[PDB]
Structures are given as structure tokens and as C-alpha cells.
Design a protein around this ligand. Sequence first.
Ligand SMILES: O=C(O)C[C@H]1CN(c2ncnc3[nH]c4cc(F)ccc4c23)CC2(CCC2)O1
Length: 167
Amino acid sequence: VNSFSGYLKLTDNVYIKNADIVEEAKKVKPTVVVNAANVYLKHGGGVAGALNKATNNAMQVESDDYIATNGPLKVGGSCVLSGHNLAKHCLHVVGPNVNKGEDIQLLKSAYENFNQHEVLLAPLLSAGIFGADPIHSLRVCVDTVRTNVYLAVFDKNLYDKLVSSFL
Ligand SMILES: O=C(O)C[C@H]1CN(c2ncnc3[nH]c4cc(F)ccc4c23)CC2(CCC2)O1
């Protein structure tokens, strides 16, 4: 038993809700919240900008130190940093950005990072400003992640569409 509430069960291990991931994190304080990161951990907009704003820019300050030490992430890769006031840990995962020409096949590699964590609160990778089809992203998630994932979808119209079209 865990503290996530109001989710629709899609499979044995994947759950979905129309919710703002920032507010969901603030209330649940999950062990892991996933950020929709870029390789530079520049949290300017989308999910990343919203999560970073909720930490009063502490996420960005920590991320800048991480990059100064380690260099950029790989597309499809991840790193674990602090969850600040939102979660114990933040798993920063880089899905491909279709608006940068990145290979959509890397989306499966990105979701594989979730399997290192027993339970996660997450967005749909490569959705939103990353330009991928969120329905495809949901399919890859369900076919790749084996751990327990609670997906927060901000947009209500898209949520309804994701549910109604789910096979
Ligand atoms: O509607 C979606 O869920 C898909 C979109 C948006 N996203 C989010 N997912 C959950 N919570 C959110 N809160 C936000 C607050 C913002 F200011 C901006 C965006 C989000 C957001 C995920 C993405 C992929 C990156 C962008 O695509």
C-alpha cells in the first residue's frame, strides 16, 4: 500500500491521473519524482521549469554543480539528485526532443531508467514541449517500465484522450 490517490489503473504496474505533477509531489512527497530533463539540466520550461520553480531554483543550483563536475547527460540517460521540498530524490531523465531532431527510439532507453526505482511519480517522457506523441510515449512506458509508475498528466483533454485510446 502507498499514498497515491485517485489514479486509474492501466496495467499491473502503471497508473495514470489528470494532475499537476508539482502539486502531486507536494502532497505525496514520493521517494522519487521524475523530471523531464535535457542533457544540460537547464530547467527552463515544461515539467522541468515548473518543478524547478517549486524548489525556489534550488534544483537548478544543484544541477549546475552536477554538470560542472560531470558534464552533460546522454539522451536516454538519467541522474539521481535531491528531490528538495518535492520528494526524497529527483530522477532527471532525458527523453529525446523531437524539436531537436533526436531519435525517438531513444524513448525506450529513457524509460528503462525507471526500472532502477521500485515506485515513481512521473510525467510522460518526451511529451509536451519535447514534441513526441504522448500516446506513443504511454505505450512505450507500459511496454518498458516494470516497476510501479504513477503518471501525472497536466492537461485534462490529453488525459481523457490517453485513457480512451489505451489498448
Ligand atoms: O500535459 C502534460 O502532462 C504533458 C506536457 C506537460 N508535462 C507535465 N506533466 C505533468 N505535470 C506537469 N506540470 C506542468 C507544469 C507546467 F508549467 C508545464 C508542464 C507541466 C507538466 C510533461 C510534458 C513533457 C515535458 C512537458 O508535456
